[PDB]
Design a protein around this ligand. Structure first.
Ligand code: P53
Ligand code: P53
Lengths: 478, 478
C-alpha cells in the first residue's frame, strides 16, 4: 500500500541502436538499412538510396555517438532512477552482412559492456532484436524478408544473442512494431520492418503479407529457441498501437474501424494465439494473395507464442466510410483516416490522446489476457534552451504525465497486468520518420542540430528531475 | 460450391415455452415467473404480482395453446423446411416447485413427444434450459438465484433433461440472455433472468452480480455434467448481443463504449474463458460489492466453459459521456445510451441495424474464436390482414433479409464459424417485454388479440414462402 503500481514496476527509457549509437563503421559494423536512409523534415520524406551515395547526408552514421559516450549517458539514466533501459542489439554489429556462420565478437562484447554498465546501476536491460536496422546486404542479396532464407539468418542472430546474454537480459522482444507494415502504400514500413525495396508494378500489399509471415514464423522460432536456452527469459512481441476510432456511430464507420483494427493487429493474434485469424485467409483469397506457408510454419507459430505484449503508443486515429468503391471495407491507412476533432496535436501532426492509451491497454487485456509492457511512449517537440541553460519542456512533462495518469487508472481501476512503462527517446536522438534532431523526445538535451552541428554535450531538461520524481514516488507524484 | 453457407447450416425458428405453450396448469405444471407477469403495452410496464391475483390478465397462461396444437405447428415448420427448431424446456413442467427429488413424468414425456415430432420431419431440436420461466416457488421460498441452494436445483433439472434427451437433442444452451441483467435498474431482467424481487432500499447492482455469479457457476456445472452424460452434446452459452457504439470519436465516448461492452459481456468471458475479467473484481472493490465466491466456484467455472456462443441480435445501441459525476465511466443502460441518428427503428423504438449483426459476429470471433449461433433475430411489428386473407409483411421480409445478407458476408467475407440462424418468434406468440400479441414476429399469423380474443387459427403470412425459399436456396435467394 505504498502506491497504485506494483513495487517492482519497470520505469525506464527507450532508444534503438541505429538511432543513437553512431560509430556505424566501428567494430566492423556492417552497413544497415538505417545507414542508407538520408535525412528529411516534416513533410519531406527520407531518401532510401541504392547504397551509400556521396552528397547525401546520413544522420544515423554519427547520430549522437552513444557508442562512445554510453558510460556517461547511462550514469544520467541511473540518476533519473531507471529500473530498466530499452534498446536494440544492432543486427549489423553481430552479423554485419547477415549470412555469416560466425557472430562478430567486437559486436557482442560491446553489448556485454552496455548491459554490464546498466547492471552496475541496478538497471535492467530490455532488448529488441530487430529495430529498423537489418543488414543492407540482406536486402540486396536476398531481397530482405521476402526470402524464406532470411528466417534462418534472423533465428541464427537471435540464438547467438540469447545464449550470450542469457544471464544478463531478462526482457526481450523480437520485431519492433512488426505491424507498421500494414501500411504498405508508402515505402517506410516495408523497408524498415522487412527490408523491402519495391520495384515499379509490384503487388505491394501482397509482397508485405508474405514478408510479415516470414517474420512471424521467425519470431516464433526464436521464442522457442530462447526458452530452451533459458526458460526464465521473458520474450514478448512488439506492436505499434494506434487505436482506430469510428468517426461516428454510423454503422459503416463502426465496420470500417473494426475491419481496420483486424488488419492492423492480426500480427498480435498470430504472436499471441499462434494462428492466423480466418478473416486474413478469406481476404488473401479475395485478392488472390498467395503466401508460401508450410505445414511446418503452422507448427512453429502455434509453438512460439509470446510471453507478453510490448507496444508503443503515441496517438490514436479516426476512420470513416467516406472513400468510394470500397464495399469490402478494405483498409487504406493512407486514405481512410480522418482528423479527430476533439484533440490537440504535435507540430508533426501526431494527435495527443492520453485516454487512448487506456483504451489500448483494455483492448489488449480483453483480447489476449497477457502481461503488457508500454515500451515506447513520448512527445516529439522543438526545444528552446532557456537563459539558465536548461530546456523548460513543460509541454513534454504535460504529455507524459497525462499518459502516466491514464496508464495508472488502467492498472488501478481496470486491473490490466502492466510490467512497466518506458518513455521513448529518453535522450535526444535521430528520429525514425524524418531523421531529424530537432524533433526531440529526450529528458536529456543533446547539442546537435539537423545540419550536423554541435558539441554533442549532454544537458538535462526540466523534465529530467520531474521524471526522476515520478519514479521515486512510483507514480504517486506526477 | 452450391452456396455461400455450409451445406448443413442450421436454419430454424425460435420460441420459448412460456411464450407459446399455454396449458400453464396442464400436467401439474408448477406456476412460474412468467405466470405472474401481467400484460402491458409499448410504454406501459408489465406488473409482477405477488402470486396470481384476480382481475389481472396473465397472457402466458393460454398464450397460443401450442401445448395442444404442436402437431399442427410443427407441420407448418417442416413446411418451411426448418433444419432446426429452438425452444426451452419449461422448468415448471419438470420440477413444478423446484426443490423436488423427482422430476415430473408428465412434463418429460411431453418434451419426448415434442422432440419426436420435430425429428419425424428431419428437424433438430435446439433446447434452452432456462428462458425466463423458473418456478415462482423458488422465488418466494429461496429468493431465486440469490440463494446458493438454487444452483443445485438448476443442475438437478439440467441433468435430468440431459439424461432424458441425450439421444434426441444435439444442441443445448443453459441460461437465456444471461447478461440482460446488466440492466439492474428496471425490474424485468433481474426478475426473468434470476428470479429477483427487489425490496425497497436494496443494493440492486450488488444483488444482481451475486445472482449472475451463481448462474454462471450453475451453467458451468451443467456443462460438465452434460458432457459426462454424452460427450457429443453441444452445450453453449446464450447472450443478448446489443453492440454498443461510441456516439463520436471523442475519446470519452470511446471509453464509455468499451467500458459498457465490458460490463455487458463479462458474462461471455466467464462462459468462454472460465474466469472473471480483472476489471470486474476491481469494480466490485470500488463499490464494496461482496460476492460469495468459493475456491470451488473458481474450479467449476474454469472446468465448465461452453462449446459455442448462442446469442440474440435485434439492435444496436449508442453511448456517450454526457452524464455528469461519472469519472469512473460506470455504465447505466437506462441513462448513458442515446439514439443512433443514422438508422430507422420499429414502432417499439427498437433500432434497425443489420450491419451490427456483422459487427457482433466479428466481435465474438475476435474475442473468443468459438463457433457461434444466431439463435434469435427478428422484427416485431403490427400485422394487418390483407383482403386475400394473408398478412403481406414485406417489412418483416426486409428486416430479416438485410440481416441474413450481413450474416452471409460475415461467413463468406470474414470467415466466422456460424452454426446456423434461427429467426425469433417464427410463429406469433406472447412478447416478453410487454406481453403483447400485437407485437408479432411470426411467419405464421395466429388469430389472438391482446384482449384475449380470436380463434387461435394459424395462417401463413407472406414471409412464410419467402423464408421457405431462403432455406431451400441455402441463402442464395433472398
Ligand atoms: O518521431 P519518430 O522518431 O518519427 O517516431 C518515434 C519513434 O516511434 C516509433 O514508431 C514510429 C516511428 C515513426 C512514425 C510513427 C511511429 C509510431 O507508430 C519507432 O519505432 C521509433 O524507432 C521512433 O523513433
Ligand atoms: O419483442 P419482445 O418479445 O419484447 O422481445 C423479443 C424476444 O427477444 C428476447 O430478448 C429481449 C426481450 C425483451 C426486450 C429486449 C430483448 C432483446 O435484448 C427474449 O429473450 C425473448 O424471450 C423475447 O420474446
Amino acid at each position: 500500500a505504498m502506491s497504485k503500481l506494483p513495487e517492482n514496476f519497470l520505469w525506464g527509457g527507450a532508444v534503438a541502436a541505429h538511432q543513437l549509437e553512431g560509430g556505424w563503421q566501428e567494430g566492423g559494423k556492417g552497413i544497415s538499412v538505417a545507414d542508407v536512409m538520408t535525412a528529411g523534415r516534416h513533410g519531406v520524406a527520407r531518401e532510401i538510396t541504392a547504397g551509400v551515395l556521396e552528397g547525401k547526408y546520413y544522420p544515423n552514421h554519427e547520430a549522437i555517438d552513444f557508442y562512445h559516450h554510453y558510460k556517461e549517458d547511462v550514469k544520467l539514466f541511473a540518476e533519473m532512477g531507471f529500473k530498466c533501459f530499452r534498446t536494440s542489439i544492432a543486427w549489423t554489429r553481430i552479423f554485419p552482412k547477415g549470412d555469416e556462420a560466425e557472430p562478430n565478437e567486437a559486436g557482442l562484447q560491446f553489448y556485454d559492456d552496455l548491459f554490464d554498465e546498466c547492471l552496475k546501476y541496478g538497471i535492467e536491460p530490455v532488448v529488441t532484436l530487430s529495430h529498423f536496422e537489418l543488414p543492407y546486404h540482406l536486402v540486396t542479396e536476398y531481397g530482405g524478408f521476402t526470402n524464406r532464407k532470411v528466417i534462418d539468418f534472423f533465428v541464427h542472430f537471435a540464438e547467438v544473442c540469447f545464449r550470450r546474454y542469457k544471464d544478463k537480459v531478462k526482457y526481450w522482444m523480437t520485431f519492433n512494431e512488426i505491424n507498421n507494415q500494414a501500411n504498405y502504400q508508402e515505402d517506410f514500413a516495408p523497408f524498415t520492418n522487412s527490408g523491402i525495396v519495391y520495384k515499379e508494378g509490384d503487388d505491394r500489399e501482397a509482397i508485405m503479407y508474405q514478408a510479415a509471415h516470414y517474420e512471424l514464423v521467425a519470431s516464433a522460432r526464436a521464442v522457442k529457441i530462447g526458452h530452451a536456452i533459458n526458460p526464465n527469459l521473458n520474450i514478448g512481441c512488439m506492436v505499434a498501437m494506434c487505436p482506430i476510432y469510428p468517426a461516428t456511430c454510423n454503422p459503416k464507420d463502426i465496420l470500417m474501424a473494426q475491419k481496420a483494427m483486424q488488419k492492423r493487429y492480426y500480427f498480435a493474434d498470430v504472436h499471441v494465439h499462434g494462428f492466423y485469424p480466418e478473416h486474413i485467409f478469406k481476404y488473401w483469397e479475395r485478392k488472390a494473395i498467395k503466401v508460401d506457408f508450410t505445414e511446418r510454419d503452422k507448427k512453429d507459430l502455434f509453438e512460439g507464442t509470446v510471453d507478453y505484449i510490448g507496444f508503443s503508443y503515441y496517438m490514436s486515429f479516426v476512420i470513416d466510410a467516406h472513400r468510394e468503391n470500397n464495399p469490402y471495407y478494405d483498409y487504406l491507412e493512407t486514405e481512410d483516416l480522418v482528423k479527430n476533432p476533439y484533440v490537440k496535436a504535435s507540430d508533426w501532426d501526431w494527435q495527443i490522446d492520453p485516454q487512448g492509451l487506456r483504451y489500448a491497454l483494455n483492448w489488449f487485456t480483453d483480447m489476449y489476457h497477457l502481461p503488457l509492457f508500454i515500451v515506447q511512449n513520448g512527445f516529439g517537440a522543438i526545444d528552446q534552451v532557456e537563459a539558465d541553460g536548461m530546456v523548460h519542456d513543460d509541454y513534454r512533462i504535460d504529455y507524459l504525465g497525462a499518459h502516466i495518469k491514464e496508464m495508472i487508472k488502467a492498472v488501478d481501476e481496470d486491473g490490466v497486468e502492466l510490467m512497466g512503462y518506458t518513455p521513448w527517446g529518453c535522450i535526444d536522438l535521430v528520429s525514425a520518420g524524418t531523421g531529424e534532431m530537432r524533433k526531440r523526445y529526450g529528458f536529456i538535451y543533446v547539442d546537435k542540430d539537423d545540419e550536423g552541428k554541435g558539441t554533442l554535450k549532454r544537458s538535462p531538461k526540466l523534465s529530467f528531475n520531474w521524471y526522476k520524481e515520478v519514479i521515486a514516488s512510483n507514480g504517486d507524484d506526477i
